[PDB]
Amino acid sequence: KPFERDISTEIYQAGNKPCNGVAGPNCYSPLQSYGFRPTYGVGHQPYRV
Amino acid sequence: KPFERDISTEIYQAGNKPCNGVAGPNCYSPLQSYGFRPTYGVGHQPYRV
């Protein structure tokens, strides 16, 4: 929804099997870390918004 | 404005005093030179329009 903050960090139970706090099939961590390297070209560099 | 050409090079007066036509602190030339090399990454190739 517009102007909403989603900080709940759980292994996303997309599938019918509980992820049991661990990774597995149909259980992927929704949070992903940005890879910002000095060698990374423009377009993938960290931009402040 | 649409269909306008700006060629006069005025040093940007970011400070309270005029740059007096010379470079220095808070005095930047608006014109920026492109760097065109074949090894440049995504988004940097020269294009004729």
Side-chain angles (χ1 to χ4, degrees):
Chain A
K1 293 304 179 182
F3 277 115
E4 192 182 7
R5 185 189 292 170
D6 191 40
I7 67 177
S8 179
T9 63
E10 291 90 4
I11 308 292
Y12 207 52
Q13 195 176 347
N16 203 20
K17 62 179 73 175
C19 311
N20 279 316
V22 302
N26 262 323
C27 293
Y28 322 111
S29 63
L31 291 204
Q32 187 64 259
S33 43
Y34 279 113
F36 297 134
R37 276 75 168 269
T39 64
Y40 267 37
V42 181
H44 295 282
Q45 261 157 24
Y47 265 83
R48 276 177 180 200
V49 174
Chain B
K1 299 303 179 184
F3 277 121
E4 195 174 3
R5 183 186 300 174
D6 194 36
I7 63 168
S8 189
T9 64
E10 288 89 1
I11 314 298
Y12 189 80
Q13 179 190 343
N16 204 20
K17 32 182 179 180
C19 296
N20 286 317
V22 292
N26 262 326
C27 288
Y28 289 98
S29 73
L31 290 193
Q32 194 61 79
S33 48
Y34 288 107
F36 293 135
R37 281 88 168 269
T39 55
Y40 272 40
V42 176
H44 298 275
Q45 264 173 41
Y47 267 81
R48 271 177 185 197
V49 184

